[PDB]
Design a protein around this nucleic acid. Structure first.
Length: 227
RNA sequence: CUUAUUUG
């Protein structure tokens, strides 16, 4: 029989695994995330580039493959894996390492890992979610009103600054530091949902980028090199 | 780089 039916043995295999480590994948309306890593180490990820994200993966692979592939390049603190149902499952996931040295090895090891002859497994980092980015903004409105305009929908905001535009054109950029990933996502989501066009102008909501951040920093160091 | 969570 079979060969014309689904294979539940796959999703059953990881169930038999999570039970033997006691991680018990927490569901998110259908998504899944791993946590509560095995003993042999103690601590918590410090402020570091310990963030890593794989992409362009197979739509049929399970975390029972991606997760061990993470625990071998470095200490995993928390992995997460998501898919969609608009017509077909996606294949993308990310993880946070005990330190950036684990995250740096992971990309340099998994990006160069051809899981299949047709799957150039892509990886990335520095998408910490800890910070939010904005573009366009109001015409002349002050930075104080920008925050207030999004403060009731993102009360987790600790600090924000507006200056270092991506260039070459003017228009500044707004860089918000939230209390948590989701805290920035709750605010970020409201802006893409339609809380944008503040002061009747225009806005574009996006996260930090590894190319954006170096350009941000190269001009941010400017006023910071002195008192 | 062939780049993602807010969610399907």
């Amino acid at each position: 029989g079979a060969m014309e039916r689904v294979n539940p043995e796959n999703k059953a295999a990881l169930e038999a695994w999570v039970r033997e480590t006691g991680i018990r994948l927490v569901q998110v309306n259908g998504q899944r995330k791993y946590g509560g890593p095995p003993p042999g180490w103690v601590g918590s990820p410090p402020p570091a580039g310990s963030e890593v994200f794989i992409g362009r993966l197979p739509q049929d692979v399970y975390e029972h493959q991606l997760i061990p592939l993470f625990q071998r390049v470095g200490r995993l603190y928390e992995f997460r894996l998501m898919m969609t149902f608009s017509g077909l499952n996606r294949g993308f996931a990310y993880a946070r390492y005990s330190s950036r040295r684990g995250a740096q090895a992971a990309i340099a090891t998994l990006h160069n890992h051809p899981l299949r002859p047709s799957c150039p497994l892509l990886v990335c980092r520095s998408t910490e979610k800890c910070e939010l980015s904005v573009d366009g903004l109001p015409p002349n409105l002050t930075r104080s009103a920008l925050l207030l305009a999004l403060q009731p929908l993102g009360p987790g905001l600790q600090e924000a600054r507006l200056l270092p535009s991506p260039g070459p054109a003017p228009g500044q950029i707004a860089l918000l530091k939230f209390s948590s990933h989701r805290a920035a996502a709750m605010a970020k989501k409201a802006l893409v949902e339609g809380q944008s066009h503040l002061c009747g102008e225009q806005v574009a909501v996006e996260w930090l980028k590894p190319d954006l951040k170096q350009r941000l920093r190269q001009q941010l160091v400017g006023p910071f090199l002195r008192s």
